[PDB]
């Protein structure tokens, strides 16, 4: 069907809301879930560092993904935003129809 869940990692609530709102408002997403309170350990430059972060789960479709990537890059305060899409294998039919109706 092409429905996807996109994971976007953001540094703060302002960013999380700003992006989540823009994606839904602009129909690049039907639904965005914000998961607060993450602890992030990652490699940076030559070492391992930590950060805070929040996670956005964006329920979108593959055809809108190229637009999403550009819009997120414009809003997200990083050189390299962490944007990855995981595929949906199957799901509630009405829900999936709904995502398509509200996306694009």
């Amino acid at each position: 069907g092409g429905e996807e869940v996109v994971l976007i990692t953001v540094p703060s609530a302002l960013v999380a809301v700003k992006i989540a709102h823009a994606l839904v408002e602009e129909r690049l997403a039907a639904c965005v879930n914000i998961v607060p309170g993450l602890t992030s350990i990652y490699r940076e430059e030559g070492s391992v560092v930590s950060d805070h972060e929040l996670l956005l789960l964006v329920k979108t479709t593959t055809d809108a993904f190229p637009k999403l990537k550009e819009r997120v890059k414009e809003l997200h305060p990083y050189e390299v935003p962490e944007i990855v899409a995981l595929p949906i294998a199957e799901g509630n039919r009405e829900y999936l129809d709904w995502l398509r109706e509200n996306t694009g």
């Binding site: 609530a13 302002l14 999380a16 809301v17 700003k18 989540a20 709102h21 914000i34 607060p36 929040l54």
Partner: protein, 118 residues
């Protein structure tokens, strides 16, 4: 033109910055849509107030996420009257319009509908 205040309110379930900001955006945009406001140039000022139980974020910050960069924003804390509806964000906007007082629409969302003056 003259000045008409626009009021609205929204409730949240928890004192989480994301919830506050998201709720504030929903309310501000809904107020503006209800009254047909296509530009922030018509707003003299916006005053936000919150109940004593919401301290993790300032609603005024949300206003700048929707572009109200030039709208004066002020905020204050509400009187803790026992029995009042908890976790409430209230907004008063001052609108430079020629709209009659009784043609200005007010917005009450979520549990704030119970406090609507109807």
């Amino acid at each position: 033109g003259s000045v008409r205040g626009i009021r609205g309110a929204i409730t949240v379930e928890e004192d989480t910055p994301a919830a506050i900001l998201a709720a504030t955006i929903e309310l501000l945009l809904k107020m503006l849509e209800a009254n047909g406001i296509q530009s922030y140039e018509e707003l003299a000022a916006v005053i936000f107030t919150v109940t004593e139980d919401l301290t993790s974020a300032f609603p005024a910050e949300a206003a700048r996420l929707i572009g109200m960069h030039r709208v004066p924003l002020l905020s204050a804390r509400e009187v803790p009257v026992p029995g009042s509806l908890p976790r409430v964000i209230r907004v008063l906007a001052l609108w430079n319009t020629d709209t009659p007082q009784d043609r200005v629409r007010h917005v009450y969302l979520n549990e704030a509908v119970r406090l609507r003056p109807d």
